[PDB]
Design a protein around this ligand. Structure first.
Ligand SMILES: OC[C@H]1O[C@H](O)[C@H](O)[C@@H](O)[C@@H]1O
Ligand SMILES: O=C1C(O)=CO[C@H](CO)[C@H]1O
Ligand SMILES: O=C1C(O)=CO[C@H](CO)[C@H]1O
Ligand SMILES: [Ca+2]
Ligand SMILES: [Ca+2]
Lengths: 255, 256
């Protein structure tokens, strides 16, 4: 009925605590219980930012409209257990003109500034992103190439095809599967793209993107070796300043 | 057919008057009617400087050639309605060797001198600038870093790529989109750069620029929190002493 799932409590800490979480007959672990943030914390934080709330059985981000600013008590949210080979399913709903995302294989990364201080780097420069977007009203829908910034795309790299998103304010289903380097995104019960990590094709995707070695050398370095040395990392969701809702979040460990 | 657009009349005043302006089927409001300066005024002023005129359906700046001096009855021009999330489209045409600019998210800013008098501060220490330039003949085109002072650049910060300007005296199309901190510049129907306000990437871009916290503390403070507390401000155009023409000026409000 239940499986022990380890989790970390703060930046780059070991997963030295465990949660007893439900697991169904097909292996899917329910990692959001609809009532608490147990095992969840802000990216780089030891607490859940207060702009993330629980309402009607959902994780809700309460956005103020500043895009990547992450102002107020905000920041991206992670379920603090590193996964390697897994299949994530969840429902998501985005507000009109809204933008969020589902990250996977994320690392908590810091750099050093010129004086030796730590600088926490964005989750999205280590973590591939399954885009979450109002495809009809958010201007990013029209940016990038071939609609590779629309919902369920691998952000700025591979478009969702078919682009079968339901309209804003409606519930969509996401699937993200990572299995021995093979990645599939699903949207509303259809596979909408597939790729292979750590290949020549993967490098080419990066080199064509905002994360290219020439445009963002640190991002290229992290994403080109996605998941770090052990090829694992966190699932999470994006504070891009807009109201968004997530529910029925479940993960099956595949090996 | 038309929408009410509020505008302010003098320095830092509330927008307590409104104009009925045409809106098209896609939501773009025509803010320059080809005939009057309704809703427009000099930055810091309650009037249009007389070096700004209307000529053949265009807003024209009549330059005397003094560069940054703003001599005579000049000074930058603003459309006095603060926009937050918006997409601006206009056409611009620059005289040979000319320099101007399209400002956005501008604030009217004053500081105090040592005796407590007001000093009107330049529009560009609060307002990002879409550079307007004759890239073939203005020496600014060779200055800065990686052509980040050529037309449609975020002046002294992000170069326009591709640099697809038309030659001097030809019409160019400008786009400036600000949507929840995402900013895009367009030139001649291509997107030529993208950046994100209020991020550490934005801070880093300022700290490498002429508006760095070391070189210009007030500019840094204003630009680092671009648009002030409500993240909004004026669209406007630059008196850099050179003849320039603007036309077909339309803004679409992108959010509620
Ligand atoms: O602490 C503030 C947060 O929690 C409150 O309950 C509000 O529902 C939410 O809008 C806000 O982001
Ligand atoms: O949606 C996005 C966008 O609009 C801004 O950049 C973010 C990270 O690449 C992405 O999540
Ligand atoms: O074009 C410009 C230049 O030549 C001088 O500085 C101005 C303000 O930054 C800019 O608009
Ligand atoms: Ca996103
Ligand atoms: Ca200029």
């Amino acid at each position: 009925n239940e499986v022990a799932v380890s989790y970390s409590k703060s930046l780059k800490a070991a997963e030295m605590d465990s949660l007893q979480l439900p697991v169904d007959a097909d292996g899917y672990i329910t990692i959001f219980d609809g009532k608490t943030f147990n095992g969840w914390r802000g990216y780089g934080k030891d607490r859940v930012p207060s702009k993330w709330t629980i309402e009607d059985g959902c994780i809700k981000f309460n956005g103020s409209g500043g895009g990547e600013a992450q102002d107020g008590d905000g920041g991206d949210l992670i379920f603090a257990h590193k996964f390697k080979n897994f299949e994530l399913e969840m429902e998501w709903k985005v507000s009109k003109g809204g933008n969020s995302g589902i990250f996977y294989l994320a690392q908590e990364v810091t750099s050093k500034d010129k004086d030796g201080n730590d600088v926490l780097e964005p989750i999205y420069i280590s973590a591939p992103e399954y885009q979450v977007l109002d495809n009809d009203n958010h201007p990013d829908a029209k940016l990038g190439k071939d609609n590779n910034r629309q919902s369920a795309s691998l952000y700025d790299m591979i478009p969702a095809v078919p682009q079968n998103a339901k309209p804003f304010g409606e519930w969509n289903k996401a699937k993200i599967m990572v299995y021995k380097g093979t990645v599939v995104h699903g949207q509303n019960d259809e596979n909408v793209l597939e790729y292979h990590l750590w290949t020549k094709q993967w490098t080419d995707l990066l080199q064509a993107s905002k994360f290219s070695q020439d445009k963002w050398p640190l991002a290229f370095e992290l994403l080109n070796n996605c998941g770090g040395e052990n090829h694992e990392g966190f699932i999470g969701m994006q504070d891009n300043g807009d109201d968004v809702w997530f529910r029925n979040i479940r993960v099956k460990v595949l090996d």
